Amino acid sequence: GVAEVVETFKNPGTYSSPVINFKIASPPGPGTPIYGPPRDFSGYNKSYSLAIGKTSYYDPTTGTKWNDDTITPVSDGQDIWRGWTHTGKWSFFNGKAGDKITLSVQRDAQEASLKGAHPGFILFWRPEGGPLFWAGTQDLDEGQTALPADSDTVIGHVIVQHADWTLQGLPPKADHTAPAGVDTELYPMKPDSYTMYYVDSGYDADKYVASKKLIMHPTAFKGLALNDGTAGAFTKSITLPKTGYYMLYVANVLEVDDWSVDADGKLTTTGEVWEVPAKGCWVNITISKP
Ligand SMILES: [Ca+2]
Ligand SMILES: [Cu+2]
């Protein structure tokens, strides 16, 4: 397509344009948060470690599915589980159109021998050119005049992995703008909407155990699978289509003997590959040039 998924703003709500944080590194679970340096990959040849939730990339626990209507046959694109926006981890970078870079994600050195990670990513372009403060959204509706440090808005709490992502019906904004280098006929700057433009996405499809399976759609994401023979890591060449500000989401795909979702939306599994101590696995994200 790619598909475009268009959300309706509601606050409080799932599609409330919540803030994400570029420093938070700790896994999901009952534990208090830990923060590290902000994940800014600008200039490239940079690398940061953080934890990602067990099923975060393709996540039945979200209770939310989308349909990719660009797929033929239509049925092959229906009932796609979303990812979880906040049990994955966010990063950003500034770059130039034509920059040829390499994105690699693998297990952090501290968990290098512990099986569990199958990292996946989504890369978005934000034509606005930088962090987008939007008054009246979930975390900016108490008189804030700017984003909190090292933070940015994204559309909602559950995320689509192979689509342009649009939010409309936002509290009207008079300074939703983009730099002059942006064609606002192709990339409109509306007073009540914004779009995170799909650039690329993919996940580590190399299984630790050949007999097992991934918690992953049977057909909708066949083009997203990355196979390099190494379980727990992927690497991919990306040529930036545009100059400006990019937002990168990384999250996990779980490997199991079997998995199921019951009528109450409860996820059950057996034979999980999950040897790490926490409810999230530690990975290192690197963007290299070349
Ligand atoms: Ca791999
Ligand atoms: Cu969330």
How many angstroms does the Cα of residue 12 sit away from the middle of ligand 1? 38
Least distant ligand from the CA of 83: 2
What's the gap in Å between 57 CA and the centre of ligand 2?
A: 13
User: What DSSP state is assigned to residue 27?
Assistant: P
Boundaries of every domain in the chain: 1-290
State how far the Cα of 11 lies from the Cα of 100, in Å rounded to an integer: 39
Q: Domain 1-290 carries which CATH code?
A: 2.60.120.1220
Q: What ligand is nearest to the CA atom of residue 19? A: 2
User: What phi-psi label fits residue 77: left (phi over 0), alpha (psi between -120 and 50 degrees) or beta?
Assistant: alpha
- What φ, ψ does residue 283 adopt, rounded to 5°? -125, 160
Amino acid identity at 62: T
Are 255 and 247 in contact, with CB atoms under 8 Å apart?
A: no
195 three-state secondary structure: strand
How far is the C-alpha of 239 from the C-alpha of 241, rounded, in Å?
Answer: 6
Resolution in A: 1.4
Elucidation technique: X-ray
Cis preceding linkage at 38, omega within 30: no
Strand 280-288 with 100-107, pairing: antiparallel
Q: Distance from the CA of 238 to the center of ligand 1, in angstroms?
A: 16
Q: How far is the CA of 85 from the centre of ligand 2 (A)?
A: 5
